């Protein structure tokens, strides 16, 4: 009994982690658009060969 | 986690045996001076 | 057929989640004091305690 | 603390048990190992009233399983939620009773009655401050009407203060399953009616009744009665358990319910009741609850309320409400129904607030009503039985065994009286 | 230097006492938890601890645990001594015998000892308060009983009962005319002025007045809360005409046996957003003496007044209450017995009422408190004898009484000795 | 000018899409021979976001039409309004999916699916600033539910950016005439959510309880039912293609539906609905047309929307109106109805005004609705997967083509996660 | 604006309501296609008080036709102005009621009823401002007084504050045509006096009497008795529709004439009626309309109330007239009669006028009145129930079906205390 108590109370003090993150395509705008925005001044950048 | 005697919740959870009954509400620290304090006059 | 007793009535529609189930009103109405900025305006005043009661009853 | 054991008797009383305390651990999250799985701290305020603290941290109840075969017990400790109640509690006899109500009362019962007598005193002398005593028995058998009785009898002899309540299930005639039902019900209620403080009185009529109508269920079975009465049962003892507005234990319904020491038996019903296609609208409120409350289908009793005139009425609501709507309704119900309530005893219903709903619901009411409509079935039985004893037929086997036709003759002759005086104040006017 | 001790009984008595002292920490900006965060008007109702915290200067009594322990697990467990919290075995179970013949001797020797232990602590006590439902066993029958030990354990020291009789038509229990009769004989003789406070009209004015059709236990005691706060507000704070507790019974009272009050409170504002009004001393007086209005289900109409105390909190100004009070007299539905020309007693107060954030009722500038003796107070003892009437007629629930140390002969001097009383008001208040 | 491209596949989707242009067409004046017929200029002024130029002044639409088998593409060239569609836009099959989802997703589908992937890509490019893609197929079918999902993967993974919105039937248990679509259909909806921006969900059963009661015909066929998904399947893009009072596009709807990014199921309604005996009979106005909006029983879907909370709702309202009966009503609606709308996002009901309504008609509203209610339809699939998974049965067809079965169980948990999330939504305060 | 919406149930309320739509769309002006076609200005100011106006121009009665079998609705679409009505107020069972009370109240009336129900609800909210209800029915049939019954009791709980009235046709033993009357005539009667606020009972022998005497017309027909019904019933509510200088709407009328709330029966009449043969040989003239208002066998009751005394009278002139002959006339009539008017209330009679009388006449009036001569319709009926409930005949139909002799105690219980309160004010003295 003293064991099952244990492992009650020791599983039972985690639960208040939501964090809503879903990100199936929306992680994939997300990426599309630190790309273009980046990259645009990447591009302005090159030096010539 | 209160299961049975273990952590404070209220008395009735408590049920202390043994030597004394547990704290309950906060207490001072250690060594506080309980009660009205005197022998002053200016 | 099943063994025992075997009850089925089922008087309690379940799989109704009440977190206040254990709320006494002795215990809630008494001790909330909850936000209320000491402001001056009443329009402020009548609308938190709207939204107080409401979550009070609910 | 006021805490109150439990001793269930024959066949009857152990299935009712058996779901009474299933129904409890449910109530207080604890599991068939006696392992707590509450989730709120008010589950283990006032736990102590049913249960006991083991080592370790197991709970067990304080029942005592009891009767004469030993084939209800061995099923009982086999099926679900066996485990919590001592084996040393578990005590039965060899030989049965037969549905004999001489044989269960004389015979056997004097020598086995001894360590019942040990068990229930060493329970009542280790709990503290003792409240009262419940038990779970049926007049239609022998063992039980007979032995739980006598038990009754001298129990109440030693502990003549404490208050004492049973629940009896009464054998009904539309359905009968024994052929001395009158006999043994007669002679139970004589035993009964200077030994019980208050009396709960369940039909299986109605019960059929009920699950049928409101229930629409096309297969009942002695699970779902059981789980009925077991109900209705643990409602009344809600706010003993539990904190309310109005708190009102079993000393209180006793001092506002029966107006005379004679009369107290009483008709139970519980409310709500909802199909179980029942679709997800609305909520319940307090119109709806006490319009089902005194609905007279609604009572777990063959006897029609409205054949007679309430002499009081108590209600038991669960769930958190205010105080106001609850006693306009009574006024209401007072006011719409007065040809219903005998006029000398002003606002004759007595109200109380539980604050802990039972689990799965938002509101719940128990009803427990004192109505002078319970002579007809004290009636039906005394015209059964004066017919069963002219035959003078199956009287040889009770009186072969230390009884004979006076005890019959003194016992017919008091539940006349009983009736007559129960009369006597239905038709007394102000 | 100025102290009073509360005493709270029974179910009814403590739950009315809970918000009681929930408004009382807020007005002296005590904490929860007793510890000010962040003078000297606390001492009438606290003493302090010698550093930090305060403690109430009350006791609880009841006989059933499931009261106290709330408290002792609730939000206010930090304020109160430990042995104050008196806690009982057994119930009465709405049985006057219990309370005052079988468990209620084991208990009053406890509080006693308790009582005598905050009386020496104080110097400049003015009376007692004692809260408690008079429809019950062992709020009316520890009642009883508390009030007689202490009329010889003290004897000439004022004393307070704020007892809730039951309603004219609504009430809980079946068998509360007989306890309120009993217990009526003995504070007949035992306080020094006591209050009605039936449960019907504080629920008419919630439905009017806050138009709330969800009207509670909880509404009701903060209702019973201001008028408790407003009646002693003259000893803890200035105010332009101090009034004390011993300034209360030598004008209330015409003559020793007549000291029945009843209450009345004015505005009652509900928690709108409108613009509300200004609600000037002239009006709020004249909602004070609507017979609607008044806290007990008595129409003043139906009989003579005999004396009448008001108290003003706020802003008022001696002037508007002259004024006001001149126009009352002139109206022809309130008039006054002959043999009293000069029926008014005026108490101002500048603090103004305080509100309980979370409640019901709102801010206001002025607010008026009202205790009155009328001969129409004859009226609720007359109903509850025809109550008693049909009761006793055909001995019912008597034998319960009886077997427990009660004899049949209470319950006929019970009957004289409110017979005698009504008999009094009749002849008290006709002509000369 | 932020066109959007139409693809439509399977049998389900080829009739879908087949009355659906009709409808288009006579909206903006089209032809069978795809020549203009209109009388307003407002007809031709945004004619470039369904139809594309070509020579001689006529209108081609940019829609494409695929299939596992071209049995269904001859019945749709000779239906009405078959010579609008180019030919070069049918790509087919010459082998069939046969009512198995791992046929059409992995041997049939990959093979084929080149082809059809080069015609959508070079649509896109045509256009100057493209807006999203819309899809119409079953998820009860072979090829419609098994290569319709992976085009959605293969579109999704080139065209981040845009949006995508699909309108899937999938069969109900009451009208059920396949015994392998809960294989076909939970493997889509596993599918569906990765990738899928918006999904609106149609029951033949609920188009079916529409016509029997709504417009009381006796005999409805599947030409009436594809013309109640045409005409709500036109109205939540009509403000694209019509001025209005306010403005809102596909991704204006999508931004003020989607709280959290897997919450994406919608259920549509279109509301007036009249039969043919009693337009003469009921006067049109926004009352009347909200109140409908609302009723349980107008929605497209097995799903009971009073069981639920609603999330989000929307409303598009198609004719000339003040903003006084549109902006009071849903005002109205929402305080009515408290109980039924989640508490912890206020104001959560979206209004819009396009002046443009259809022909025949004064006034028309479409309705977007995410619930939690739902989840029920889901519930019910997974109910006969996981009854049919235990047994194996019908699987070794499914085994057949190299799919193996932890994406069967991989399907059930993702499905359950699904239905959890919803459930969790739903009971939750502030 | 203060309109009314009517419910008609059984065979007499759809052939009453038939007959009553007729007199009040010639009133109106409006012809059996809807299309107003009127004269004067003043028949539209408050024509929304009985019709809707549907889009197109066309007015469509507000009402709700009730029946368990198809055999009247048909007739009534296909007679004259069958085409008013709205088919979707159309409901009607497939078994009918067979002239049973429990049939149409608990079997086949409960699960009618929930259709029916949201018809009246949404025909209720859809307008702006309610004024009451007016039913049509009988209690002597099965589906109208079962059914009907019930609906008066469903609204009630829903609309508390609206008023009421009902047009009843009681029963009398004279034309005896159906066998079961007393049954079903009691239990209906019971159940009208806690929820009806007005009630006014018809009988056939007494407009049987009134068309062979009054009329002179040697063969009447159901058509004709429905008309002198319909008569009095738009003359009723003649000021809520028309200017006047005296206005007096239902509330006015029950203010005035209810002294009790348990006594609200009453008995109506109509003035002038004229054989066609003599109408030009007699003048139109207060004196002689008050003259035959009063006539103890003009009303449309078979009780003499020359056999009681007035409580309350209420007299509606139509018509242009002088105030000082309508006030003369009623103090002559009060005073030349004293003893028929009780005399501890003064002025027991209410007057109002109309500008508009009926098209085709001049002056009319509608008396209404409240005396205690209705209690011999209660006691005629009783007389026949105990003749037959003694025997217990005819009974096992309605105990067949979830019925019980209970509440046929109940019911004739409070129908005895109801003749006895009502006619004990006739020996009442001040
Ligand atoms: N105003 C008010 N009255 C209360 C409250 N609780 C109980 N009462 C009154 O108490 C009366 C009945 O007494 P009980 O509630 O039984 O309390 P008691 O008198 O101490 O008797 P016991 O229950 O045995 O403790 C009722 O008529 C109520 O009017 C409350 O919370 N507020
Ligand atoms: N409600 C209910 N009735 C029961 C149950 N078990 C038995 N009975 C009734 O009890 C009657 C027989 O009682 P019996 O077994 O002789 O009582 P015993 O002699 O004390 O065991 C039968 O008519 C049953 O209807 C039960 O679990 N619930
Ligand atoms: N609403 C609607 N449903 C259809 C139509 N045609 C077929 N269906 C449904 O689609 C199901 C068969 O789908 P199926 O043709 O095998 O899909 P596919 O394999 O992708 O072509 C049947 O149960 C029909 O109910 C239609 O025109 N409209
Ligand atoms: N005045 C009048 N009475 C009618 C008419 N139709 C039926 N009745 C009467 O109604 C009684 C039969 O009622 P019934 O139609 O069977 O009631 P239901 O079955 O509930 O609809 C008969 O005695 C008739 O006299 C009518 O058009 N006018
Ligand atoms: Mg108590």
């Known amino acids: 009994i003293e064991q099952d108590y244990m492992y009650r109370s020791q599983q039972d003090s985690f639960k208040p982690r939501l964090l809503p993150k879903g990100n199936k395509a929306s992680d994939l705008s997300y990426t599309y658009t630190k790309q273009k925005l980046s990259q645009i001044q990447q591009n302005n950048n090159k030096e010539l060969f | 986690y209160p299961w049975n005697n273990r952590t404070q919740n209220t008395l009735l959870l408590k049920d202390d045996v043994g030597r004394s009954k547990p704290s309950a509400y906060s207490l001072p620290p250690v060594d506080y001076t309980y009660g009205r304090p005197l022998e002053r006059d200016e | 057929p099943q063994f025992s007793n075997a009850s089925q009535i089922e008087v309690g529609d379940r799989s109704e989640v009440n977190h206040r189930r254990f709320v006494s009103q002795s215990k809630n109405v008494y001790g909330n004091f909850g936000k209320f900025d000491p402001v001056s305006n009443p329009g402020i005043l009548a609308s938190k305690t709207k939204w107080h009661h409401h979550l009070q009853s609910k | 603390m006021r805490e109150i ?26 599991d068939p190992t006696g392992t707590y799985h509450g989730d709120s701290d008010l589950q283990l305020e006032r736990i102590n009233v049913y249960y006991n603290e083991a080592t370790g ?235 089902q409350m005194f609905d007279a289908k609604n009572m777990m009793c063959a006897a029609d309320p409205r054949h007679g005139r309430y002499l009081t009425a108590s209600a038991l609501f669960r769930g958190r409400m205010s105080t106001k709507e609850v006693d306009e309704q009574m006024l209401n119900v007072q006011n719409k129904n007065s040809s219903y309530f005998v006029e000398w005893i002003p606002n004759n219903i007595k109200s109380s607030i539980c604050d802990i709903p039972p689990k799965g619901l938002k509101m719940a009411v128990t009803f427990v009503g004192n109505s002078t409509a319970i002579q007809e079935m004290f009636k039906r039985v005394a015209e059964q039985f004066t017919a069963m004893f002219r035959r003078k037929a199956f009287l040889h086997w009770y009186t072969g065994e230390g009884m004979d036709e006076m005890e019959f003759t003194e016992a017919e002759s008091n539940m006349n009286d009983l009736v007559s005086e129960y009369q006597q104040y239905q038709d007394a006017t102000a | ?40 008007a606390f001492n009438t109702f606290f003493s302090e601890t010698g550093a930090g915290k305060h403690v109430p200067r009350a006791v609880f009594l009841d006989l059933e645990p499931t009261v106290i322990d709330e408290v002792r697990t609730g939000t206010y467990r930090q304020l109160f001594h430990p042995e104050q919290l008196i806690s009982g075995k057994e119930d009465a179970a709405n049985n006057f015998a219990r309370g005052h013949y079988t468990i209620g001797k084991e208990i009053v020797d406890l509080c006693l000892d308790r009582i005598r232990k905050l009386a020496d602590n104080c110097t400049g006590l003015q009376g007692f ?84 059709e969800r009207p509670t236990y909880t509404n009701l005691n903060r209702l019973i809360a201001q008028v408790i706060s407003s009646l002693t507000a003259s000893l803890r704070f200035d105010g332009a005409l101090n009034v004390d507790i011993t300034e209360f019974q030598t004008n209330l009272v015409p003559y020793p046996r007549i000291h029945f009050m009843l209450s009345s409170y004015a505005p009652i504002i509900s928690a709108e957003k409108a613009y509300h009004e200004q609600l000037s001393v002239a009006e709020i007086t004249n909602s004070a003496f609507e017979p609607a209005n008044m806290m007990a289900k008595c129409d003043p109409r139906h009989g003579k007044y005999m004396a009448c105390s008001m108290m003003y909190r706020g802003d008022v100004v001696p002037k508007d209450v002259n004024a006001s009070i001149a126009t009352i007299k002139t109206k022809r539905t309130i008039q006054f017995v002959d043999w009293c020309p000069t029926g008014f007693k005026v108490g101002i107060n500048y603090q103004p009422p305080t509100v309980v954030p979370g409640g019901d009722l709102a801010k206001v500038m002025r607010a008026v408190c009202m205790i009155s003796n009328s001969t129409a107070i004859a009226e609720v003892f007359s109903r509850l004898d025809h109550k008693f009437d049909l009761m006793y007629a055909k001995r019912a629930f008597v034998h319960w009484y009886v077997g427990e140390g009660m004899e049949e002969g209470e319950f006929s001097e019970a009957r004289e000795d409110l017979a005698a009383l009504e008999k009094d008001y009749e002849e008290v208040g006709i002509e000369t």
């Open chain 4, 5 to 30: 054991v439990h001793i269930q008797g024959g066949q009857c009383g152990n299935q009712i048990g058996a779901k009474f305390w299933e129904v409890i651990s449910d109530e207080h999250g604890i």
């Open chain 4, 57 to 291: 941290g197991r709970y067990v109840p304080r029942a005592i399983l009891m009767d004469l075969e030993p084939g209800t017990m061995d099923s009982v400790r086999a099926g679900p939620f066996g485990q919590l109640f001592r084996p040393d509690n578990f005590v039965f006899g060899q030989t049965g009773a037969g549905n004999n109500w001489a044989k269960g009362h004389y015979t056997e019962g004097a020598e086995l009655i001894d360590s019942v007598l040990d068990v229930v005193r060493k329970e009542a002398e280790g709990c503290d401050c003792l409240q009262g005593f419940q038990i779970t028995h049926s007049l239609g058998g022998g063992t039980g009407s007979g032995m739980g009785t006598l038990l009754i009898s001298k129990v109440r002899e030693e502990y003549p203060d404490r208050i004492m309540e049973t629940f009896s299930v009464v054998p009904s005639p539309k359905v009968s399953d024994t052929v001395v039902e009158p006999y043994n019900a007669t002679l139970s209620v004589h035993q009964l009616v200077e030994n019980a403080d208050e009396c709960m009185v369940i039909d299986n009529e109605a019960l059929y009744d009920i699950c049928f109508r409101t229930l629409k269920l096309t297969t009942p079975t002695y699970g779902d009665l059981n789980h009925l009465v077991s109900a209705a049962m643990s409602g009344v003892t809600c706010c003993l358990r539990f904190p309310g507005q109005l708190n009102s234990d079993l000393r209180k319904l006793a001092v506002n319910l029966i107006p005379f020491p004679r009369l107290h038996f009483f008709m139970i019903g519980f409310a709500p009741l909802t199909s179980r296609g029942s679709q997800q609208y609305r909520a319940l409120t307090v119109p709806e609850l006490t319009q």
């Open chain 5, 1 to 40: 230097m100025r102290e009073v001790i509360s005493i709270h009984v029974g179910q009814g008595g403590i739950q009315v006492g809970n918000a009681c002292w929930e408004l009382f920490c807020l007005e002296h900006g005590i904490q929860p938890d007793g510890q000010m965060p962040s003078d000297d």
């Open chain 5, 129 to 212: 308060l004692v809260f408690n439902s008079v429809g019950g066993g062992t709020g009316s029958g520890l009642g009883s009983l508390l009030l007689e030990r202490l009329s010889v354990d003290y004897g000439k020291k004022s004393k307070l009962g704020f007892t809730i009789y039951p309603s004219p038509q609504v009430s809980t229990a079946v068998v509360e005319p007989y306890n309120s009769i009993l217990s009526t004989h003995s504070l007949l003789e035992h306080t020094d002025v006591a209050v009605m406070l039936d449960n019907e009209a504080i629920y008419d004015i919630c439905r009017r007045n806050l138009d709330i």
